[PDB]
Design an enzyme around this catalytic site. Structure first.
Site, PDB file in Angstrom:
ATOM      1  N   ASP A   6       0.779  -1.230   0.000  1.00  0.00           N
ATOM      2  CA  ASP A   6       0.000   0.000   0.000  1.00  0.00           C
ATOM      3  C   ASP A   6       0.817   1.290   0.000  1.00  0.00           C
ATOM      4  O   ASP A   6       0.416   2.282   0.613  1.00  0.00           O
ATOM      5  CB  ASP A   6      -0.958  -0.012   1.187  1.00  0.00           C
ATOM      6  CG  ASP A   6      -1.742  -1.302   1.269  1.00  0.00           C
ATOM      7  OD1 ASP A   6      -2.323  -1.705   0.237  1.00  0.00           O
ATOM      8  OD2 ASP A   6      -1.774  -1.914   2.357  1.00  0.00           O
ATOM      9  N   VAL A  46     -10.296  -0.989   1.526  1.00  0.00           N
ATOM     10  CA  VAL A  46     -11.375  -0.393   0.741  1.00  0.00           C
ATOM     11  C   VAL A  46     -12.764  -0.994   0.982  1.00  0.00           C
ATOM     12  O   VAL A  46     -13.763  -0.272   1.048  1.00  0.00           O
ATOM     13  CB  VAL A  46     -11.070  -0.483  -0.779  1.00  0.00           C
ATOM     14  CG1 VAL A  46     -10.930  -1.945  -1.204  1.00  0.00           C
ATOM     15  CG2 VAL A  46     -12.175   0.200  -1.576  1.00  0.00           C
ATOM     16  N   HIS A 103      -4.902  -1.967  -5.683  1.00  0.00           N
ATOM     17  CA  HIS A 103      -4.271  -0.759  -6.199  1.00  0.00           C
ATOM     18  C   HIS A 103      -5.269   0.311  -6.617  1.00  0.00           C
ATOM     19  O   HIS A 103      -6.031   0.130  -7.579  1.00  0.00           O
ATOM     20  CB  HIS A 103      -3.370  -1.127  -7.376  1.00  0.00           C
ATOM     21  CG  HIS A 103      -2.311  -2.119  -7.023  1.00  0.00           C
ATOM     22  ND1 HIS A 103      -1.543  -2.761  -7.968  1.00  0.00           N
ATOM     23  CD2 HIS A 103      -1.899  -2.592  -5.823  1.00  0.00           C
ATOM     24  CE1 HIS A 103      -0.707  -3.589  -7.369  1.00  0.00           C
ATOM     25  NE2 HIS A 103      -0.904  -3.505  -6.066  1.00  0.00           N
ATOM     26  N   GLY A 114       1.492   2.939  -2.779  1.00  0.00           N
ATOM     27  CA  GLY A 114       0.969   3.802  -3.826  1.00  0.00           C
ATOM     28  C   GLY A 114       1.395   3.343  -5.212  1.00  0.00           C
ATOM     29  O   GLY A 114       1.663   4.167  -6.099  1.00  0.00           O
TER      30      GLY A 114
HETATM   31  N1  LIG Z   1      -3.016  11.977   0.186  1.00  0.00           N
HETATM   32  C1  LIG Z   1      -2.346  11.112  -0.588  1.00  0.00           C
HETATM   33  N2  LIG Z   1      -2.861   9.923  -0.851  1.00  0.00           N
HETATM   34  C2  LIG Z   1      -2.055   9.188  -1.647  1.00  0.00           C
HETATM   35  C3  LIG Z   1      -0.827   9.526  -2.175  1.00  0.00           C
HETATM   36  N3  LIG Z   1      -0.320   8.489  -2.947  1.00  0.00           N
HETATM   37  C4  LIG Z   1      -1.233   7.560  -2.879  1.00  0.00           C
HETATM   38  N4  LIG Z   1      -2.312   7.918  -2.108  1.00  0.00           N
HETATM   39  C5  LIG Z   1      -3.373   7.031  -1.650  1.00  0.00           C
HETATM   40  O1  LIG Z   1      -2.785   6.085  -0.783  1.00  0.00           O
HETATM   41  C6  LIG Z   1      -3.481   4.819  -0.908  1.00  0.00           C
HETATM   42  C7  LIG Z   1      -2.506   3.670  -1.048  1.00  0.00           C
HETATM   43  O2  LIG Z   1      -3.210   2.436  -1.106  1.00  0.00           O
HETATM   44  P1  LIG Z   1      -3.054   1.443  -2.341  1.00  0.00           P
HETATM   45  O3  LIG Z   1      -3.806   1.989  -3.491  1.00  0.00           O
HETATM   46  O4  LIG Z   1      -3.385   0.082  -1.847  1.00  0.00           O
HETATM   47  O5  LIG Z   1      -1.493   1.442  -2.803  1.00  0.00           O
HETATM   48  P2  LIG Z   1      -0.776   0.256  -3.654  1.00  0.00           P
HETATM   49  O6  LIG Z   1      -1.252  -1.053  -3.053  1.00  0.00           O
HETATM   50  O7  LIG Z   1       0.728   0.446  -3.486  1.00  0.00           O
HETATM   51  O8  LIG Z   1      -1.229   0.477  -5.084  1.00  0.00           O
HETATM   52  C8  LIG Z   1      -4.467   4.972  -2.060  1.00  0.00           C
HETATM   53  O9  LIG Z   1      -5.795   5.104  -1.572  1.00  0.00           O
HETATM   54  C9  LIG Z   1      -3.981   6.215  -2.792  1.00  0.00           C
HETATM   55  O10 LIG Z   1      -5.038   6.892  -3.437  1.00  0.00           O
HETATM   56  C10 LIG Z   1      -0.287  10.808  -1.884  1.00  0.00           C
HETATM   57  O11 LIG Z   1       0.779  11.299  -2.263  1.00  0.00           O
HETATM   58  N5  LIG Z   1      -1.134  11.543  -1.065  1.00  0.00           N
HETATM   59  O1  LIG Z   2      -3.390 -12.722   1.414  1.00  0.00           O
HETATM   60  P1  LIG Z   2      -1.905 -12.987   1.618  1.00  0.00           P
HETATM   61  O2  LIG Z   2      -1.593 -14.467   1.761  1.00  0.00           O
HETATM   62  O3  LIG Z   2      -1.068 -12.303   0.553  1.00  0.00           O
HETATM   63  O4  LIG Z   2      -1.525 -12.294   3.049  1.00  0.00           O
HETATM   64  C1  LIG Z   2      -0.198 -12.391   3.613  1.00  0.00           C
HETATM   65  C2  LIG Z   2       0.273 -11.029   4.077  1.00  0.00           C
HETATM   66  O5  LIG Z   2       0.422 -10.156   2.938  1.00  0.00           O
HETATM   67  C3  LIG Z   2      -0.118  -8.891   3.235  1.00  0.00           C
HETATM   68  N1  LIG Z   2      -0.710  -8.374   2.005  1.00  0.00           N
HETATM   69  C4  LIG Z   2      -0.842  -9.079   0.831  1.00  0.00           C
HETATM   70  N2  LIG Z   2      -0.922  -8.323  -0.235  1.00  0.00           N
HETATM   71  C5  LIG Z   2      -0.840  -7.031   0.267  1.00  0.00           C
HETATM   72  C6  LIG Z   2      -0.845  -5.773  -0.357  1.00  0.00           C
HETATM   73  O6  LIG Z   2      -0.595  -5.721  -1.560  1.00  0.00           O
HETATM   74  P2  LIG Z   2      -0.738  -4.353  -2.416  1.00  0.00           P
HETATM   75  O7  LIG Z   2      -2.153  -3.829  -2.164  1.00  0.00           O
HETATM   76  O8  LIG Z   2      -0.532  -4.766  -3.870  1.00  0.00           O
HETATM   77  O9  LIG Z   2       0.352  -3.412  -1.901  1.00  0.00           O
HETATM   78  N3  LIG Z   2      -0.760  -4.680   0.436  1.00  0.00           N
HETATM   79  C7  LIG Z   2      -0.659  -4.851   1.758  1.00  0.00           C
HETATM   80  N4  LIG Z   2      -0.629  -5.983   2.462  1.00  0.00           N
HETATM   81  C8  LIG Z   2      -0.722  -7.049   1.647  1.00  0.00           C
HETATM   82  C9  LIG Z   2      -1.169  -9.103   4.321  1.00  0.00           C
HETATM   83  C10 LIG Z   2      -0.626 -10.308   5.081  1.00  0.00           C
HETATM   84  O10 LIG Z   2       0.095  -9.922   6.246  1.00  0.00           O
HETATM   85 MG   LIG Z   3      -2.764  -1.892  -1.967  1.00  0.00          MG
END
Ligand SMILES: Nc1nc2c(ncn2[C@@H]2O[C@H](COP(=O)(O)OP(=O)(O)O)[C@@H](O)[C@H]2O)c(=O)[nH]1
Ligand SMILES: O=P(O)(O)OC[C@H]1O[C@@H](n2cnc3c(OP(=O)(O)O)ncnc32)C[C@@H]1O
Ligand SMILES: [Mg+2]
Ligand SMILES: Nc1nc2c(ncn2[C@@H]2O[C@H](COP(=O)(O)OP(=O)(O)O)[C@@H](O)[C@H]2O)c(=O)[nH]1
Ligand SMILES: O=P(O)(O)OC[C@H]1O[C@@H](n2cnc3c(OP(=O)(O)O)ncnc32)C[C@@H]1O
Ligand SMILES: [Mg+2]
Lengths: 431, 431
Positions: free
Chosen positions: B17, B305, B45, B19
């Site tokens: 997570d 989400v 994402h 970004g």
């Molecule tokens: N305020 C703010 N939110 C951000 C920024 N970059 C990303 N986000 C938010 O941070 C969150 C990161 O969660 P995620 O989408 O799971 O990231 P990912 O798994 O690496 O793609 C998202 O809801 C983005 O919209 C930033 O620079 N500022």
């Molecule tokens: O379900 P699992 O077996 O993968 O869980 C095992 C561990 O992996 C963590 N998990 C898996 N995928 C992602 C993820 O991917 P993102 O959104 O692309 O950045 N972002 C954040 N945490 C994540 C959660 C569990 O501790």
């Molecule tokens: Mg994510």
């Protein structure tokens, strides 16, 4: 100077036993570090230096070079008993002070006795359940990698910390396996007891693998050699699945197995046998179950070192080689066992596959298809001459040089070495 | 021209997570191909273009660019139902004609319903068996990868060939799972029936992945973008095992997941969040369970989400970042969510770990150790100013620029992008 030193890689390009031990041994003579990145002792690498012959499995083939450090990366699966059995078997062949130049990554996974037993059980079941299994090495490689993916397996670092916690998690992993096969024995306390010994016997060699490799690639320049195991078409992702081993034997495996980025990977050598072999079950397009197959099998000594199980033999196959290259991006090749073809009047080479009188556009992802394809061969004249003493390109007769070019041309990669004997000095460098 | 075109990679540098969706979306605007190489819909994402917000999981984040082809590589594990549910959920948000620009590798593995159910069962068992589990996403990613390693799993190509053979092997895989958990339901015919539909609904999009990528990297030059999933410290090999996901989220995963050699990998971008987050169980050195943690959690919207499960929040941690770099070899960074720190007077940053009043020499392979370490912090002054509208380096106030430099300096890698908002245009290119 910015990215640090780059490592040299040696990978199998067919279905294993291409001669990795031999090529690696040759390249390890001036290497500072020689290492394994994936696989377990399911691998078998033969080395012939002087009049001495070795067959490593877990030990990197450079363990022979007392001035170099042998390293077992995080991607490898270690069966402690087999490791020591191997080392001792070689100690009796002159191997001395290996433990002083062997380093083990603390993130590598452990192959437990029950993993090996379960490997055998799964094979017997697959046999009596549907007429055919995989042809596994029965080293529990598959089961161990299965536990790794599940995160139920145990690692080197787990074994060296609180033994009580290790013992508890071990017991759970054991019972989980008896749920799959209720007839599985498992002497929990016995194995557990033996393991405690291995822990201390292996403690002085273990280190953090990531920091070890990083330091070596960004410290003063070093020559790092990576010894691949198994082969391209045995790759869990790109091989003739499910008739494959359970790790990535392809180039990507160097990165995931040693924790090194792609920019630190340099020369990637594809070891290519002059003809093809397969140890287990599965499709083998150019397989020759006949007089030719027996000759290759015979002149090539294509059989397991211990079990003596003969290997399936067939003509060279460019479809699998070209495919192997698409995935590995070889920078050069080592064409081995050329001498085995010395006695043939004509040599056939698989160039493409036809399914319905039509040439398949690419290597089939579905192994079942391969069983149905018809090989389109190209016949080449033999050089009908003894090349076992060839040491230069010019030494090789016309037809032989032609054969080498044939390989380079249809693979788009250049051959850098030609093998004409199992011993180290039985090689020819083209450039 | 010799090796062909090189791909650009975007990987997570912490525990997910960071970004990735955002950085990938920005880079996909002029990409010919955008793809996923590992993971499954366990990934989430988020993308914000215009006033529209999307949350992809299986679909590459570039599915938005109608002029680009989205590709799901062989390393990914596909759960057909989730795939379509996702696509439709986005179709309602304006996504149209996705199926015409989506390509699936025929070597990718299938996540079956029972894999998801078993994932849940294994977690409930780990919870009531020892007080704590992994914190899995319950998508059956672990079980599917476990079957992949065992070679018992089924792939895209298996689903599209003889359905009767697929049905038989499917049944076996199913029963094998009920041996692990005898209470597992599994409506064999129902699922089997649904799958037959997905086969035909997905047939026109499937292709040979190896040939597809090879053609693209060696045909006329193309811009290929690889969207990583999960993150470095969640890596099955290099993460805080066993509190990790079951695939290699690190750089090596691009090679093993798309079948492309290291020389075809170019820019590798590390997405770094201004602070740290963790979704599941496991060590989290800089974790802040307090007023600070709530603020980061709040201003950052750190929660799932759908499920709305809040994520653990903590100060930036350089130990995990430096470690992540040793394995990934980032060529540049994308520092995100800088705006979240806009309101802080002083910001702390973890720089090293101490166990017994002594600074550990490197990141511990044993996750249990991390639980015992004491973070050595460095306090930095905040810029106490709204940067959400910053679009140039000069726009950022003194303390903020200092924070960016702090990151570059202690990581030895340069920051190329600074995020100050979730939307696409809320970014700053430094070079
Ligand atoms: N305020 C703010 N939110 C951000 C920024 N970059 C990303 N986000 C938010 O941070 C969150 C990161 O969660 P995620 O989408 O799971 O990231 P990912 O798994 O690496 O793609 C998202 O809801 C983005 O919209 C930033 O620079 N500022
Ligand atoms: O379900 P699992 O077996 O993968 O869980 C095992 C561990 O992996 C963590 N998990 C898996 N995928 C992602 C993820 O991917 P993102 O959104 O692309 O950045 N972002 C954040 N945490 C994540 C959660 C569990 O501790
Ligand atoms: Mg994510
Ligand atoms: N005659 C001959 N034997 C060779 C040559 N290259 C390798 N060998 C032998 O071929 C065999 C290959 O088996 P193996 O060691 O398992 O290869 P690896 O698994 O790729 O290391 C070994 O016994 C080698 O000694 C060669 O050029 N000529
Ligand atoms: O035991 P297994 O699960 O890996 O068996 C699965 C299949 O993998 C094949 N196998 C595994 N490792 C090697 C090998 O490695 P080498 O000596 O380093 O080149 N050489 C030749 N064949 C091999 C045998 C099975 O068909
Ligand atoms: Mg061998």
């Amino acid at each position: 100077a910015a990215t640090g030193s780059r490592v040299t890689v040696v990978l199998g390009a067919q279905w294993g036993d291409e001669g990795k031990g031999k090529v690696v041994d040759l390249l390890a003579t001036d290497a500072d570090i020689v290492s394994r990145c994936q696989g377990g002792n399911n691998a078998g690498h033969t080395v012939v230096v002087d009049g001495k012959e070795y067959d490593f499995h877990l030990l990197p083939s450079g363990i022979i070079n007392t001035k170099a450090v042998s390293f077992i990366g995080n991607g490898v699966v270690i069966h402690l008993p087999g490791l020591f059995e191997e080392a001792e078997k070689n100690e009796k062949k002159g191997l001395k002070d290996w433990e002083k130049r062997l380093i083990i990554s603390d993130r590598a996974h452990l192959v437990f006795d029950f993993h090996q037993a379960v490997d055998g059980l799964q094979e017997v079941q697959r046999q009596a359940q549907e007429g055919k299994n995989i042809g596994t090495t029965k080293k529990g490689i598959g089961p161990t990698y299965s536990s790794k993916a599940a995160r139920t397996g145990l690692r080197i670092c787990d074994l060296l910390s609180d033994f009580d916690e290790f013992s508890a998690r071990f017991k759970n992993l054991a019972h989980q396996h008896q749920s799959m096969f209720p007839t599985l024995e498992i002497d929990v306390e016995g194995q557990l007891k033996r393991l405690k010994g291995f822990a201390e016997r292996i403690r002085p060699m273990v280190r953090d693998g990531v920091y070890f490799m990083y330091e070596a690639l960004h410290g003063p320049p070093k020559k790092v050699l990576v010894e691949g195991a198994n082969a391209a078409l045995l790759d869990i992702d790109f091989g003739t699945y499910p008739f494959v081993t359970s790790s990535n034997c392809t180039v990507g495996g160097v990165c995931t197995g040693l924790g090194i980025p792609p920019q630190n990977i340099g020369d990637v050598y594809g070891v290519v046998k002059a003809y093809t072999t397969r140890v287990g079950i599965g499709a083998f397009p150019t397989e020759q179950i006949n007089e030719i197959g027996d000759l290759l099998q015979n002149r090539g000594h294509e059989w397991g070192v211990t079990t003596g199980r003969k290997r399936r033999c067939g003509w060279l196959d460019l479809m699998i080689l070209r495919y192997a290259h698409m995935v590995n991006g070889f920078t050069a090749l080592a064409l081995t066992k050329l001498d085995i073809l010395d006695v043939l009047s004509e040599i056939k080479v698989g160039i493409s596959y036809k399914l319905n009188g039509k040439r398949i556009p690419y290597f089939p992802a579905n192994q079942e298809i391969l069983q149905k394809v018809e090989v389109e061969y190209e016949t080449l004249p033999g050089w009908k001459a003894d090349t076992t003493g060839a040491r230069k390109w010019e030494d090789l007769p016309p037809q032989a040089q032609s054969y080498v070019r044939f390989v380079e041309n249809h693979m788009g990669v250049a051959v850098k070495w030609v093998g004409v004997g199992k011993s180290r000095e039985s090689m020819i460098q083209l450039f």
